[PDB]
Amino acid sequence: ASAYQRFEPRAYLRNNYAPPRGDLCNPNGVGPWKLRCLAQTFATGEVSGRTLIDIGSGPTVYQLLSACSHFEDITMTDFLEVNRQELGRWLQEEPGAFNWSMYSQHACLIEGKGECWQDKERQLRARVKRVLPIDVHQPQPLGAGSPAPLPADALVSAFCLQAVSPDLASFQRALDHITTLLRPGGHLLLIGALEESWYLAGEARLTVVPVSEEEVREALVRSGYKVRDLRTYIMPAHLQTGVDDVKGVFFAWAQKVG
Ligand SMILES: Nc1ncnc2c1ncn2[C@@H]1O[C@H](CSCC[C@H](N)C(=O)O)[C@@H](O)[C@H]1O
Ligand SMILES: NC[C@H](O)c1ccc(O)cc1
């Protein structure tokens, strides 16, 4: 955990959202795959409501590109101040903000509604009402009197739980904790690394729990979810770059049981 005090937003973005992993031209890449899972899930029209919360957003927003057109009140979160400040720079279009345009363009491409990427980013920025601190290790991850509308109609969490858990049990509890934020019958979109044990973020070296698809499924079930969809992307050699040892990426569409 204290290892996250050395976490460098720019280094994390560089490692994971800049070429090669950040080049979206090849459909077989991890970027396009993640956006497709998100887009396809929301296109079903079955994941809807008013409020949504992004768990452990870090300094990234790609994970809300397709989502933002389905929820008018969006809450982004992260444990680190530096990350909340990094997000702020993009949301407020401040100087030095990260360039997500490639991802916006591709979310527009995939969605196929003829929408220009600027309108997309406009909508995301418009619907993100607040960026809050969060600790998934606490029974109440957002705290006591959080400005976030609870319970949420839906939750999105990408590369967080597994990335902040040393073992499987921590992972399960973390899932339990965030699940309390979700209204019954609500929906969870979980994206995470498969069989990864570490990843770098500048001077920071994060040690994480290598999980499998079955282990992830079993966790969702234990937390009281119905798994609507669980998919795996196997990481191509070309995208294995020594910023980590991830073998694949999973996407889970879980619905909290009423
Ligand atoms: N105890 C905790 N609770 C919630 N988030 C935590 C946490 N400890 C670290 N984090 C955050 O977990 C994030 C993992 S990086 C994930 C970034 C983004 N969601 C993605 O799709 O790439 C980091 O920003 C880190 O600050
Ligand atoms: N914990 C984040 C993990 O290292 C990761 C993040 C993003 C990727 O595309 C691949 C792997």
From Swiss-Prot:
Transmembrane domains' residue ranges: none
Outcome of mutating residue 244 to A/N: Strongly reduced enzyme activity towards phenylethanolamine. Decreases affinity for phenylethanolamine 200-fold. Decreases affinity for S-adenosyl-L-methionine 3-fold
EC number: 2.1.1.28
This protein's UniProt keywords: Catecholamine biosynthesis, Methyltransferase, Phosphoprotein, S-adenosyl-L-methionine, Transferase
Positions annotated to bind octopamine: 196, 244
Domain of life per record: Eukaryota
Effect in UniProt of substituting residue 12 to F: Strongly increases KM for phenylethanolamine and S-adenosyl-L-methionine
Pfam family, any one: NNMT_PNMT_TEMT
InterPro entries membership: NNMT/PNMT/TEMT_CS, NNMT_TEMT_trans, SAM-dep_methyltransferase, SAM-dependent_MTases_sf
Keyword Flavoprotein listed: no
Family per similarity comment: Belongs to the class I-like SAM-binding methyltransferase superfamily. NNMT/PNMT/TEMT family.
Functional summary from the UniProt entry: Catalyzes the transmethylation of nonepinephrine (noradrenaline) to form epinephrine (adrenaline), using S-adenosyl-L-methionine as the methyl donor. Other substrates include phenylethanolamine and octopamine. Also methylates normetanephrine.
Protein name listed in UniProt: Phenylethanolamine N-methyltransferase
Organism: Homo sapiens (Human)
